[PDB]
Each structure stands twice: as C-alpha cells, then as structure tokens.
C-alpha cells in the first residue's frame, strides 16, 4: 500500500516533502541533467566567441 503513496521528507533545512522517492530521485537527478543542458550551451557560447 505505502509504495503507492507520496510520503513526507524534511531535507536539509527541513523543507517539507510529500513525495515518492522516485520523484525525489528524479528532482535530484533532474537537477544534475539540467545543469548539463545549461553548461553545454554556455560552453558553446564561450567556444564560438573564443574561436
């Protein structure tokens, strides 16, 4: 039953979750991937002008 459900977490400062871990994981992993997306284009920006 529980694995169906969204359950609560107080992260570091304690901010409140009511979550599945897969959500939890995804927001964590998603945080990394977004940066990769951002870094790549940002890098691309540095490249073209630098070239």
């Amino acid at each position: 039953q529980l694995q169906y459900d969204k359950v609560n977490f107080y992260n570091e400062d304690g901010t409140i979750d009511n979550l599945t871990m897969e959500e939890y994981y995804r927001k964590l992993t998603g945080k990394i991937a977004s940066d990769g997306e951002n870094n790549n284009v940002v890098n691309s920006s540095n490249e073209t002008l630098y070239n």
């Binding site: 977004s34 951002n38 691309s44 920006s45 073209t48 002008l49």
Partner: protein, 51 residues
Amino acid sequence: TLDKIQKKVNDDIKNTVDEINKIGEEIATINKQIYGQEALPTEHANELRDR
C-alpha cells in the same frame, strides 16, 4: 487524476520558469560579452548575432 494533472501543469510552468530565468542571464551576459567601454568589431558579431 484531474487534480494530479493540474499539479503537473503547475510545475511545467516552474519548469518553464527555470528555463527562462537561467536563460535570462545567459543572454544578458552574452550581450555583456559582445561589447563595452572598449569595442568589438562587427564582422564576427554576425555569427554571434547568429548564436
């Protein structure tokens, strides 16, 4: 489920927001890179404009 998708639509925006806010300086800085008190000639700015 109607309620769930409502909430999914909500973050999609915050998903949007993150994109623009992150973009907002990416472009602003990029403009900051092209020129300043000392100047950048034009011909490559074409491709920078292209970027």
